[PDB]
Amino acid sequence: DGVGNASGDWHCDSTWMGDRVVTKSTRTWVLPSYNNHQYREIKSGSVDGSNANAYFGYSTPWGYFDFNRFHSHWSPRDWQRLINNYWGFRPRSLRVKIFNIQVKEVTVQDSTTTIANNLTSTVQVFTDDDYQLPYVVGNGTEGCLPAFPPQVFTLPQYGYATLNRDNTENPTERSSFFCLEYFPSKMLRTGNNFEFTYNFEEVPFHSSFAPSQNLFKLANPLVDQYLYRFVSTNNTGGVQFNKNLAGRYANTYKNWFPGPMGRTQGWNLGSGVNRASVSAFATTNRMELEGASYQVPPQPNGMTNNLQGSNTYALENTMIFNSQPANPGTTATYLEGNMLITSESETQPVNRVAYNVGGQMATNNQSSTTAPATGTYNLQEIVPGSVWMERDVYLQGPIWAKIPETGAHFHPSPAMGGFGLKHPPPMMLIKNTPVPGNITSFSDVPVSSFITQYSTGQVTVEMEWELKKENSKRWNPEIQYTNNYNDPQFVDFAPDSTGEYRSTRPIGTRYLTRPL
Amino acid sequence: DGVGNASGDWHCDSTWMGDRVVTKSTRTWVLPSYNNHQYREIKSGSVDGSNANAYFGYSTPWGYFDFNRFHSHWSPRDWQRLINNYWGFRPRSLRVKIFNIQVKEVTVQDSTTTIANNLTSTVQVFTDDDYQLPYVVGNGTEGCLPAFPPQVFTLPQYGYATLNRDNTENPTERSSFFCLEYFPSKMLRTGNNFEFTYNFEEVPFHSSFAPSQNLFKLANPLVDQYLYRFVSTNNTGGVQFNKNLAGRYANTYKNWFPGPMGRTQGWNLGSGVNRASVSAFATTNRMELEGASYQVPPQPNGMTNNLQGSNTYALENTMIFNSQPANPGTTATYLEGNMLITSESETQPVNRVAYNVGGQMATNNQSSTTAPATGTYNLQEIVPGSVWMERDVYLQGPIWAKIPETGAHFHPSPAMGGFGLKHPPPMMLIKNTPVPGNITSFSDVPVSSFITQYSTGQVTVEMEWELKKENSKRWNPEIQYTNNYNDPQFVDFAPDSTGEYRSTRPIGTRYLTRPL
Amino acid sequence: SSFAPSQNLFKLANPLVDQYLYRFVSTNNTGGVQFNKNLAGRYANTYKNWFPGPMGRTQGWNLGSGVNRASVSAFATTNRMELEGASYQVPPQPNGMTNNLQGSNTYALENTMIFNSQPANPGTTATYLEGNMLITSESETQPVNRVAYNVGGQMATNNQSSTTAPATGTYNLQEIVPGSVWMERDVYLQGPIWAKIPETGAHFHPS
């Protein structure tokens, strides 16, 4: 409509209506003109001793909007209300609006640096609906909307990696180039606005509960089994048997088995007592692809990193986060007090411990000449009758990941956590239109001289969630997340005297308990 | 409508629907104020030793839009899809939109050079529908919309040549002056937009196929002809005859003849072995008009420049292109590795070779006293029963040319390639309106003082194409264009580390094969 | 699926942007744990959502210029499965691996379909060299499928202590894990369209 008329209004709110909760979030963003209006080929050779580091790729003029973090949609008080009272939750609908656009021109004469409004300048916006572009949103990267509503943020620059030849910086014939300007886009002046709507596919609810029973202790404690086990051979080697007694969980027939495991090193925290002067990388867990060795830092699902009490943690099976945001490219060492370290101890009744060996199997054939022998195993994979619990979500953590298109997959739950989607919420791309500097003569060669410009505006995201209610018959009181501090010098989840937000603790979803 | 409202949106796309393909292209352009708002008489005398160089003409304040190149409408992947799967293609419809206009004023005080928006300034636009103006669009000149969508381009300045007297810079009484301001034009401020629509006349489809048979080898190989030839005279000079045998193509009666030829010099490429220190111009092919000798660098249709394998090329029968755009007025020498050189070797089954002699004819009357004699010929023209193939189109090359209005013509296919049209898509002309500097007194003499200004905006072109499907019964696999490179250091048809587009190879349309 | 992947399974993070996630890299002179942030483009050290498909190690033989070991009888060292008291060669191996890297003349022969250009007489016992044979390559699936000739990865074999340094061991076989992705074997014009699933009442992933 016009220079003097506002395109949209601020909405930041939560509404709770029975089985449904609606979240509204509004933020202010800034867009730089990246690459000076150009597409650049980007590449790397081996770095820090590793060829797994090498890649071939393109950097682009465009920027994108990322909302795949829970703190983007949820207040700390609203998150506490959900974890305390519900068995499960799932996403249903998404709505996005971009509005109140302002384009600015920056000029320097003799070091003055004046800044001014340009009314006739445009911004370009599009959504990748058919998934033609490479999707970089679900990989745990920075640049999402901020946890605190007043904070103002810079949009991330879009880029991708294609194929590389023989673990080197060079490309292959199969390697691909994608142009964003080939797709159609909306053009916006200061009066104009953009809107999009999405529906999520049917997905299973996340489980916000901890088991109240061990997988191996399900027989009644009072009653004996009608089943027998081999315990012995006599002086002539004749087989002998005994009945299975009540409460003897070590010797009982079992219907179901625990989930898959791979052994990972355990390190003590706090009082500790670990080995000195160690370089971690040579002894880390790895998988081999195309001739290179890769660390796979979240391990695959079905294990627990920490026992309960205990200060032993398997570090490569744990999500590690920082309380405060960091500057790009930092190489600084961080001690444990700075870090936020997660524990999966609630899943221990059904999930095997990562630091320990899995079990034992037979290695020989017994004979009158030879005694029977067993051996321990460090890895096991899926077996029929297998049961496990998936990794917990965090307020600091991601909601979704895109399933890769290969035509074959098994059990599609992402390792970091969250919901695995065949058709994920789509990539949203924004760029500043090139505006040319004074040109007085004709050339076939393309213009490289442009006026310097940046853009600013407001973004609103609305999300709908489906809730599963608790139906417990437990008489005694349950565990709950609480604000509990001894002699506090500051309020957590609040601004400080300088105005910086403080977030000391990581928050999971499992406080409620259910029988197996 | 307004200062804060956008006139149009970005559309860059291809849609394939059975027999029809639609192409959409969007670009950003810059317009200079050419000639400082004045019309100038332009002229030349003899240059580089030639009077064919002399001309008399006018230069104008206006600029024009040119779309007669395939890379303007076609992506490299889309062009590969057409050449691989279709017998023929033709143009059907054209739509043009000009929008998002921005007028800027440039001021200099003491070397500062400040640039600012002028809201009340106008741009003027018109189309030459009745072909009253001289048409300069179909002559292989620079200034067309760019191959890569992100590239920003300067519009070419309009000019023309009229009649000149006695191969000198002077005019004739028949010589003509044309004023653009005499035609009606639309006037546009920053809010305003312009649109045009065109329909192409019926034209024959281009042939995207190579012949699978020789013109002279069409008789069945197994069966003899019922026809006889003279082979001999006896000791008394009495005539003798022999029957024509199966597979003897050298001695067989023929229905049809090859197309017209003129001999052109052949030069070796690569390993080569050509003559040293040669100046080319004195020995080049020429046609004489109005007392001057002119090189005619594309030769006329019906010949082939290169045999297949072979490194001999007739250079004056070949389209030569540069991979990268060049600065105006360059006099630099270029070697073969920089150049993109085309081959017509697919048409060799029906088209005579340019470097070789055409054939032999009788030069005498035989008698008992005199033996019979023959002579070779270096040129031949159209004969009844003549068949030939027209020159191939290239992605780097032009779509159309205007047929000249003389009232008489034969077979109207242009020498460079493409479609010859009596009523071509029309000339589109744009100018910046003169805005005056401060005037304090009256004069009859016209104002020569104006504020300095330039314009910028977006242009969209939409084109519809009709396709002819392949109907082959060939059992074995065909030749296809492929991305095939050994040990590549860059991706072809992509930007580099500096952001410059790379286009190493020329691409033709003939990969499919058909029987004669 | 008649297509080849244009991206590696482990290279999906944006090359320009750093992760908000940290990894353990070190212990100090008193054995206290130390951490570093994950940087942009460092694919060796990045958190991963998805894992490659199942693998079993199979011997690799050079073709063309080659340079393989002389006078070998193949059968004793071949891959086998045991049924009802007997050892059986299982010549197509199970799905989720790639036989050949690209370029490279190393092929895992027991993971490859081998065909003859010409039909043969029944009962022939004749030796055939490589030039007579038609040998397939699965190099397009290498961005998501592990190589058969190479080891799969490494896992922890011990518990670290002030007395004991940490240790790892390589594995030659691995099976399906949750979050696993792979590509099935390609069809050929010379090859078969279909197979019947056996009736047992239980099966997994029937390709």
Coordinates of all heavy atoms in Angstrom, one line a residue, chain A residues 1 39-41 58 118-120 124 165 170-171 173 175 177 181-187 189 191-192 436-439 442 444-447 451, chain B residues 3-6 8-10 12 14 30 78 100-102 117 142-143 151-152 154-155 190 327 454 456 483 485 487-489 491 494-497 499:
Chain A
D1 N 0.8 -1.2 0.0 CA 0.0 0.0 0.0 C 0.9 1.3 0.0 O 0.9 1.9 -1.1 CB -1.1 0.0 1.1 CG -1.7 -1.4 1.4 OD1 -1.1 -2.4 1.1 OD2 -2.7 -1.4 2.1
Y39 N 27.9 -15.1 -7.1 CA 28.0 -16.5 -6.7 C 29.4 -17.0 -6.7 O 30.1 -16.6 -7.7 CB 27.2 -17.4 -7.7 CG 25.7 -17.6 -7.5 CD1 24.8 -16.6 -8.1 CD2 25.2 -18.7 -6.9 CE1 23.5 -16.8 -7.9 CE2 23.8 -18.9 -6.8 CZ 23.0 -17.9 -7.3 OH 21.6 -18.1 -7.2
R40 N 29.9 -17.6 -5.7 CA 31.3 -18.0 -5.6 C 31.6 -19.5 -5.4 O 30.9 -20.1 -4.6 CB 32.1 -17.1 -4.6 CG 32.0 -15.6 -4.7 CD 32.7 -15.0 -3.6 NE 32.6 -13.5 -3.6 CZ 32.9 -12.7 -2.6 NH1 33.2 -13.2 -1.4 NH2 32.9 -11.4 -2.7
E41 N 32.5 -20.0 -6.2 CA 32.9 -21.4 -6.0 C 33.8 -21.5 -4.7 O 34.7 -20.8 -4.6 CB 33.5 -22.0 -7.3 CG 33.8 -23.5 -7.2 CD 35.3 -23.7 -7.2 OE1 35.9 -23.4 -8.2 OE2 35.8 -24.2 -6.1
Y58 N 29.4 -24.3 -3.6 CA 29.0 -23.0 -4.0 C 28.5 -22.1 -2.8 O 27.8 -22.6 -2.0 CB 28.0 -23.0 -5.2 CG 28.7 -23.6 -6.4 CD1 28.4 -24.9 -6.8 CD2 29.5 -22.9 -7.2 CE1 29.0 -25.5 -7.9 CE2 30.1 -23.4 -8.3 CZ 29.9 -24.7 -8.6 OH 30.5 -25.3 -9.7
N118 N 16.1 4.2 1.2 CA 15.8 4.2 -0.3 C 14.4 3.7 -0.4 O 14.3 2.4 -0.3 CB 16.9 3.5 -1.1 CG 16.8 3.5 -2.6 OD1 17.6 2.9 -3.3 ND2 15.8 4.3 -3.1
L119 N 13.4 4.5 -0.8 CA 12.0 4.1 -1.0 C 11.7 3.2 -2.1 O 10.8 2.4 -2.0 CB 11.2 5.4 -1.0 CG 10.8 6.1 0.3 CD1 11.3 5.4 1.5 CD2 11.0 7.6 0.3
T120 N 12.4 3.4 -3.2 CA 12.1 2.6 -4.5 C 12.9 1.3 -4.6 O 12.6 0.5 -5.5 CB 12.4 3.7 -5.6 OG1 11.2 4.4 -5.7 CG2 12.9 3.1 -6.9
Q124 N 13.7 -9.6 -2.5 CA 13.1 -10.8 -3.2 C 13.0 -12.0 -2.3 O 13.9 -12.4 -1.7 CB 14.0 -11.2 -4.4 CG 13.7 -10.6 -5.7 CD 14.8 -10.8 -6.7 OE1 14.9 -11.8 -7.4 NE2 15.7 -9.8 -6.8
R165 N 36.2 -35.0 -5.6 CA 36.9 -36.2 -6.3 C 38.1 -36.7 -5.4 O 39.0 -35.9 -5.2 CB 37.4 -35.8 -7.7 CG 38.1 -36.9 -8.5 CD 38.0 -36.6 -10.0 NE 38.4 -35.3 -10.4 CZ 39.7 -34.8 -10.4 NH1 40.7 -35.6 -10.1 NH2 39.9 -33.6 -10.9
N170 N 39.0 -30.8 -5.6 CA 38.4 -30.9 -7.0 C 37.0 -31.5 -7.2 O 36.7 -32.4 -6.4 CB 39.4 -31.6 -7.9 CG 40.8 -30.9 -8.0 OD1 40.8 -29.7 -8.3 ND2 41.8 -31.7 -7.9
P171 N 36.3 -31.0 -8.1 CA 35.0 -31.6 -8.5 C 34.9 -32.9 -9.5 O 36.0 -33.3 -9.9 CB 34.4 -30.4 -9.3 CG 35.5 -29.8 -10.0 CD 36.6 -29.8 -8.9
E173 N 32.3 -35.0 -12.6 CA 31.3 -34.8 -13.7 C 29.9 -34.9 -13.1 O 29.0 -34.3 -13.8 CB 31.5 -35.8 -14.9 CG 32.9 -36.3 -15.0 CD 32.9 -37.6 -15.8 OE1 32.0 -37.8 -16.7 OE2 33.8 -38.5 -15.7
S175 N 29.1 -33.7 -10.2 CA 28.9 -32.5 -9.3 C 28.0 -31.5 -10.0 O 28.1 -31.2 -11.2 CB 30.3 -32.0 -8.9 OG 30.4 -30.6 -9.0
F177 N 25.6 -27.6 -10.1 CA 25.5 -26.2 -9.7 C 24.0 -25.8 -9.8 O 23.3 -26.3 -10.6 CB 26.3 -25.3 -10.6 CG 26.0 -23.8 -10.5 CD1 26.3 -23.2 -9.3 CD2 25.2 -23.1 -11.4 CE1 25.9 -21.9 -9.1 CE2 24.9 -21.8 -11.2 CZ 25.2 -21.2 -10.0
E181 N 18.1 -17.7 -8.8 CA 17.4 -16.8 -9.7 C 16.6 -17.5 -10.8 O 15.8 -16.9 -11.4 CB 18.5 -15.8 -10.2 CG 18.9 -14.7 -9.1 CD 20.1 -15.1 -8.3 OE1 20.4 -16.3 -8.3 OE2 20.7 -14.3 -7.7
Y182 N 16.9 -18.8 -11.0 CA 16.2 -19.6 -12.0 C 14.8 -19.9 -11.4 O 13.9 -20.1 -12.3 CB 17.0 -20.8 -12.5 CG 16.4 -21.5 -13.7 CD1 15.9 -20.7 -14.8 CD2 16.5 -22.8 -13.9 CE1 15.4 -21.3 -15.9 CE2 16.1 -23.4 -15.1 CZ 15.5 -22.7 -16.1 OH 15.0 -23.2 -17.2
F183 N 14.5 -20.0 -10.2 CA 13.2 -20.1 -9.5 C 12.4 -18.8 -9.6 O 13.0 -17.8 -9.7 CB 13.3 -20.5 -8.1 CG 13.9 -21.9 -7.7 CD1 15.2 -22.1 -7.7 CD2 13.0 -23.0 -7.4 CE1 15.7 -23.4 -7.4 CE2 13.5 -24.2 -7.1 CZ 14.9 -24.4 -7.1
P184 N 11.1 -18.8 -9.7 CA 10.3 -17.6 -9.5 C 10.2 -17.0 -8.0 O 10.1 -17.7 -7.1 CB 8.9 -18.0 -10.0 CG 8.9 -19.5 -10.0 CD 10.3 -19.9 -10.1
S185 N 10.3 -15.6 -7.9 CA 10.3 -15.0 -6.5 C 9.4 -13.7 -6.5 O 9.2 -13.1 -7.5 CB 11.7 -14.7 -6.0 OG 12.4 -13.8 -6.8
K186 N 8.7 -13.5 -5.3 CA 8.0 -12.2 -5.1 C 8.9 -11.0 -4.9 O 9.9 -11.2 -4.2 CB 7.0 -12.4 -3.9 CG 5.5 -12.4 -4.3 CD 5.1 -13.7 -4.7 CE 4.2 -13.7 -5.9 NZ 3.3 -14.9 -6.0
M187 N 8.6 -9.8 -5.4 CA 9.4 -8.6 -5.2 C 8.7 -7.6 -4.3 O 7.5 -7.4 -4.5 CB 9.8 -8.0 -6.6 CG 10.8 -8.9 -7.4 SD 11.4 -8.3 -9.0 CE 13.0 -7.6 -8.6
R189 N 8.5 -3.8 -2.2 CA 9.0 -2.5 -1.7 C 8.5 -2.3 -0.2 O 8.0 -3.2 0.3 CB 8.5 -1.5 -2.8 CG 9.4 -1.2 -4.0 CD 9.1 0.1 -4.7 NE 9.2 -0.1 -6.2 CZ 9.4 0.9 -7.0 NH1 8.9 2.1 -6.8 NH2 10.2 0.8 -8.1
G191 N 6.0 -0.7 1.3 CA 4.6 -1.0 1.5 C 4.2 -2.5 1.5 O 3.1 -2.7 2.0
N192 N 4.8 -3.4 0.8 CA 4.5 -4.8 0.5 C 4.8 -5.8 1.7 O 5.6 -5.5 2.5 CB 5.1 -5.2 -0.8 CG 4.7 -4.3 -1.9 OD1 3.5 -4.0 -2.0 ND2 5.6 -3.8 -2.7
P436 N 22.4 -0.8 -9.5 CA 23.6 -0.2 -10.1 C 24.2 1.2 -9.8 O 23.4 2.1 -9.6 CB 23.3 -0.4 -11.6 CG 22.2 -1.5 -11.6 CD 21.4 -1.0 -10.4
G437 N 25.5 1.3 -9.8 CA 26.2 2.6 -9.7 C 26.3 3.3 -11.1 O 25.7 2.8 -12.0
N438 N 26.7 4.6 -11.2 CA 26.6 5.3 -12.4 C 27.4 4.7 -13.6 O 28.6 4.6 -13.5 CB 27.0 6.8 -12.1 CG 27.0 7.7 -13.3 OD1 27.8 8.6 -13.4 ND2 26.0 7.6 -14.3
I439 N 26.7 4.4 -14.7 CA 27.4 3.8 -15.9 C 27.2 4.8 -17.1 O 26.0 5.1 -17.3 CB 26.9 2.3 -16.2 CG1 26.7 1.5 -14.9 CG2 27.8 1.6 -17.2 CD1 28.0 1.0 -14.2
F442 N 28.5 1.9 -22.9 CA 28.1 0.5 -23.2 C 29.3 -0.6 -23.1 O 30.4 -0.2 -23.6 CB 27.5 0.4 -24.6 CG 27.2 -1.1 -25.0 CD1 26.1 -1.7 -24.5 CD2 28.0 -1.8 -25.9 CE1 25.8 -3.0 -24.8 CE2 27.7 -3.1 -26.2 CZ 26.6 -3.7 -25.7
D444 N 29.6 -5.1 -23.4 CA 29.1 -6.5 -23.3 C 29.4 -7.1 -21.9 O 28.7 -8.0 -21.5 CB 29.5 -7.3 -24.5 CG 28.5 -8.4 -25.0 OD1 27.3 -8.1 -24.9 OD2 29.0 -9.5 -25.4
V445 N 30.6 -6.8 -21.3 CA 31.0 -7.3 -20.0 C 30.0 -6.8 -18.9 O 29.7 -5.7 -18.9 CB 32.4 -6.8 -19.7 CG1 32.9 -7.2 -18.3 CG2 33.4 -7.2 -20.8
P446 N 29.6 -7.7 -18.0 CA 28.6 -7.4 -17.0 C 29.0 -6.4 -15.9 O 30.2 -6.4 -15.5 CB 28.3 -8.8 -16.3 CG 28.6 -9.8 -17.4 CD 29.9 -9.2 -18.0
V447 N 28.1 -5.6 -15.4 CA 28.4 -4.5 -14.4 C 28.8 -5.1 -13.1 O 28.2 -6.1 -12.7 CB 27.3 -3.5 -14.3 CG1 26.2 -3.5 -15.4 CG2 26.7 -3.4 -12.9
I451 N 25.5 0.3 -5.9 CA 25.4 1.0 -4.6 C 25.3 0.1 -3.4 O 24.6 -0.9 -3.5 CB 24.1 2.0 -4.7 CG1 24.4 3.1 -5.7 CG2 23.7 2.5 -3.4 CD1 23.2 3.5 -6.5
Chain B
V3 N 5.1 5.1 -5.0 CA 6.6 5.0 -4.7 C 6.9 3.8 -3.9 O 8.0 3.2 -4.1 CB 7.0 6.3 -3.9 CG1 8.4 6.3 -3.3 CG2 6.8 7.6 -4.8
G4 N 6.0 3.3 -3.0 CA 6.2 2.2 -2.1 C 5.7 0.9 -2.6 O 5.8 -0.1 -1.8
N5 N 5.2 0.8 -3.8 CA 4.5 -0.4 -4.3 C 5.3 -1.0 -5.5 O 5.6 -0.2 -6.4 CB 3.0 -0.2 -4.6 CG 2.2 -1.4 -4.5 OD1 1.3 -1.5 -3.7 ND2 2.4 -2.4 -5.4
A6 N 5.6 -2.3 -5.5 CA 6.3 -2.9 -6.6 C 5.4 -3.2 -7.9 O 4.3 -3.6 -7.7 CB 7.0 -4.2 -6.1
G8 N 6.0 -5.2 -10.6 CA 6.0 -6.7 -11.0 C 6.9 -7.6 -10.2 O 7.6 -7.1 -9.3
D9 N 6.9 -8.9 -10.5 CA 7.6 -10.0 -9.8 C 8.6 -10.7 -10.7 O 8.5 -10.6 -11.9 CB 6.7 -10.9 -9.2 CG 5.8 -10.4 -8.1 OD1 6.3 -9.7 -7.2 OD2 4.6 -10.6 -8.2
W10 N 9.6 -11.4 -10.1 CA 10.6 -12.2 -10.9 C 10.1 -13.5 -11.3 O 9.6 -14.3 -10.6 CB 11.9 -12.3 -10.0 CG 13.2 -12.7 -10.6 CD1 13.6 -14.0 -11.0 CD2 14.2 -11.8 -11.0 NE1 14.8 -13.9 -11.6 CE2 15.2 -12.6 -11.6 CE3 14.4 -10.4 -11.0 CZ2 16.4 -12.1 -12.1 CZ3 15.6 -9.9 -11.5 CH2 16.6 -10.7 -12.0
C12 N 11.6 -16.8 -13.6 CA 12.6 -17.4 -14.5 C 12.3 -18.9 -14.4 O 12.4 -19.5 -13.4 CB 14.1 -17.2 -14.0 SG 14.9 -15.8 -14.9
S14 N 11.1 -22.9 -16.9 CA 10.7 -23.7 -18.1 C 9.6 -24.7 -17.8 O 9.7 -25.2 -16.7 CB 11.9 -24.4 -18.8 OG 12.5 -25.3 -17.9
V30 N 20.5 -1.5 -17.0 CA 20.9 -0.1 -16.7 C 20.8 0.7 -18.0 O 21.3 0.2 -19.0 CB 22.3 0.1 -16.0 CG1 22.1 0.8 -14.6 CG2 23.2 -1.1 -16.0
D78 N 18.3 -27.6 -20.1 CA 17.0 -27.6 -20.9 C 17.4 -27.8 -22.4 O 16.6 -28.4 -23.1 CB 16.2 -26.4 -20.6 CG 15.2 -26.5 -19.4 OD1 14.4 -27.4 -19.4 OD2 15.4 -25.7 -18.5
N100 N 9.4 -1.9 -12.3 CA 10.3 -1.5 -11.2 C 11.3 -0.4 -11.6 O 12.5 -0.6 -11.2 CB 10.9 -2.7 -10.4 CG 9.9 -3.6 -9.8 OD1 10.1 -4.8 -9.5 ND2 8.7 -3.0 -9.4
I101 N 10.9 0.6 -12.3 CA 11.7 1.7 -12.8 C 12.3 2.6 -11.7 O 11.5 2.9 -10.8 CB 10.9 2.4 -13.9 CG1 11.1 1.8 -15.3 CG2 11.1 3.9 -13.9 CD1 10.0 0.9 -15.7
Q102 N 13.5 2.9 -11.8 CA 14.2 3.8 -10.8 C 15.1 4.8 -11.5 O 16.0 4.4 -12.2 CB 15.0 3.0 -9.8 CG 14.2 1.9 -9.0 CD 15.0 0.6 -8.9 OE1 14.9 -0.3 -9.7 NE2 15.8 0.6 -7.8
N117 N 18.0 9.5 -5.7 CA 16.8 9.2 -6.4 C 16.0 10.5 -6.9 O 16.0 11.4 -6.1 CB 15.7 8.6 -5.5 CG 15.8 7.1 -5.6 OD1 15.8 6.5 -6.7 ND2 15.8 6.4 -4.5
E142 N 26.4 -7.5 -30.4 CA 26.4 -7.6 -29.0 C 25.3 -6.7 -28.3 O 24.9 -5.7 -28.9 CB 27.8 -7.2 -28.4 CG 28.9 -8.0 -29.0 CD 30.2 -7.3 -28.6 OE1 30.0 -6.1 -28.2 OE2 31.3 -7.8 -28.8
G143 N 25.0 -6.9 -27.0 CA 24.0 -6.2 -26.2 C 22.7 -6.9 -26.0 O 21.8 -6.3 -25.4
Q151 N 23.5 -11.9 -13.8 CA 24.3 -10.8 -14.5 C 23.5 -9.6 -14.8 O 22.3 -9.7 -15.3 CB 25.1 -11.5 -15.6 CG 25.9 -12.7 -15.3 CD 26.7 -13.2 -16.5 OE1 26.2 -13.4 -17.6 NE2 28.0 -13.3 -16.3
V152 N 24.1 -8.4 -14.6 CA 23.4 -7.1 -14.8 C 24.0 -6.5 -16.1 O 25.2 -6.5 -16.3 CB 23.3 -6.2 -13.6 CG1 22.9 -4.8 -13.9 CG2 22.5 -6.8 -12.5
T154 N 24.2 -3.4 -19.5 CA 23.9 -2.1 -20.1 C 23.2 -2.3 -21.5 O 23.7 -3.1 -22.2 CB 25.3 -1.4 -20.3 OG1 25.9 -1.3 -19.0 CG2 25.1 0.0 -20.8
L155 N 22.2 -1.5 -21.7 CA 21.5 -1.5 -23.1 C 22.3 -0.8 -24.2 O 23.0 0.2 -23.9 CB 20.1 -0.8 -23.0 CG 19.1 -1.4 -22.0 CD1 17.9 -0.5 -21.8 CD2 18.7 -2.8 -22.4
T190 N 8.2 6.1 -11.5 CA 8.6 4.9 -10.6 C 7.5 3.9 -10.4 O 7.8 2.7 -10.3 CB 9.3 5.5 -9.4 OG1 10.3 4.5 -9.0 CG2 8.3 5.8 -8.2
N327 N 35.8 -6.6 -24.3 CA 35.8 -5.1 -24.2 C 35.6 -4.5 -25.6 O 36.1 -5.1 -26.6 CB 37.0 -4.5 -23.5 CG 36.9 -4.8 -22.0 OD1 35.9 -4.5 -21.4 ND2 38.0 -5.2 -21.5
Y454 N 20.5 8.7 -14.9 CA 20.5 7.4 -15.5 C 19.3 6.6 -15.0 O 18.7 7.0 -14.0 CB 21.9 6.7 -15.2 CG 22.2 6.2 -13.8 CD1 21.8 4.9 -13.4 CD2 22.9 7.0 -12.9 CE1 22.1 4.5 -12.1 CE2 23.2 6.5 -11.7 CZ 22.8 5.3 -11.3 OH 23.1 4.8 -10.0
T456 N 17.4 2.5 -14.2 CA 17.5 1.1 -13.9 C 16.2 0.4 -13.8 O 15.2 1.1 -13.4 CB 18.5 0.9 -12.8 OG1 19.0 -0.4 -12.8 CG2 17.9 1.3 -11.4
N483 N 27.7 -34.6 -20.4 CA 28.8 -33.9 -19.6 C 29.9 -34.9 -19.4 O 29.7 -35.7 -18.5 CB 28.2 -33.5 -18.3 CG 28.8 -32.2 -17.7 OD1 28.8 -31.2 -18.4 ND2 29.3 -32.3 -16.5
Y485 N 34.2 -35.2 -19.0 CA 35.4 -34.4 -18.8 C 36.4 -35.4 -18.1 O 36.0 -36.1 -17.3 CB 35.1 -33.1 -18.0 CG 34.2 -32.1 -18.7 CD1 32.9 -32.1 -18.4 CD2 34.7 -31.2 -19.6 CE1 32.0 -31.1 -19.0 CE2 33.9 -30.3 -20.2 CZ 32.6 -30.3 -19.9 OH 31.8 -29.3 -20.6
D487 N 39.4 -35.7 -15.4 CA 40.1 -35.0 -14.3 C 39.7 -33.5 -14.2 O 40.6 -32.7 -14.2 CB 41.6 -35.4 -14.1 CG 42.5 -35.3 -15.3 OD1 42.7 -34.1 -15.8 OD2 43.0 -36.3 -15.8
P488 N 38.4 -33.1 -14.2 CA 38.1 -31.7 -14.2 C 38.5 -30.8 -13.0 O 38.4 -31.2 -11.8 CB 36.5 -31.8 -14.2 CG 36.2 -33.1 -13.6 CD 37.3 -34.0 -14.1
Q489 N 39.0 -29.6 -13.3 CA 39.4 -28.7 -12.2 C 38.3 -27.6 -11.9 O 38.5 -26.9 -10.9 CB 40.7 -28.0 -12.6 CG 41.8 -28.9 -13.2 CD 42.4 -29.8 -12.3 OE1 42.9 -29.4 -11.2 NE2 42.3 -31.1 -12.6
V491 N 33.8 -26.8 -12.7 CA 32.5 -27.3 -13.4 C 32.2 -26.3 -14.5 O 32.2 -25.1 -14.3 CB 31.3 -27.4 -12.4 CG1 30.0 -27.7 -13.1 CG2 31.6 -28.4 -11.3
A494 N 29.1 -23.0 -15.0 CA 28.9 -22.6 -13.6 C 29.8 -21.4 -13.3 O 30.7 -21.2 -14.1 CB 29.2 -23.8 -12.7
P495 N 29.5 -20.7 -12.2 CA 30.5 -19.6 -11.8 C 31.8 -20.1 -11.2 O 31.9 -21.2 -10.7 CB 29.6 -18.9 -10.7 CG 28.6 -19.9 -10.3 CD 28.3 -20.7 -11.5
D496 N 32.9 -19.3 -11.3 CA 34.2 -19.7 -10.7 C 34.4 -19.0 -9.3 O 33.4 -18.4 -8.8 CB 35.3 -19.4 -11.6 CG 35.7 -17.9 -11.8 OD1 34.9 -17.0 -11.5 OD2 36.8 -17.7 -12.3
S497 N 35.6 -19.1 -8.7 CA 35.9 -18.6 -7.4 C 35.7 -17.0 -7.4 O 35.4 -16.5 -6.3 CB 37.3 -19.0 -6.9 OG 38.3 -18.1 -7.4
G499 N 33.5 -15.5 -9.3 CA 32.1 -15.2 -9.7 C 31.9 -15.1 -11.2 O 30.7 -14.8 -11.6

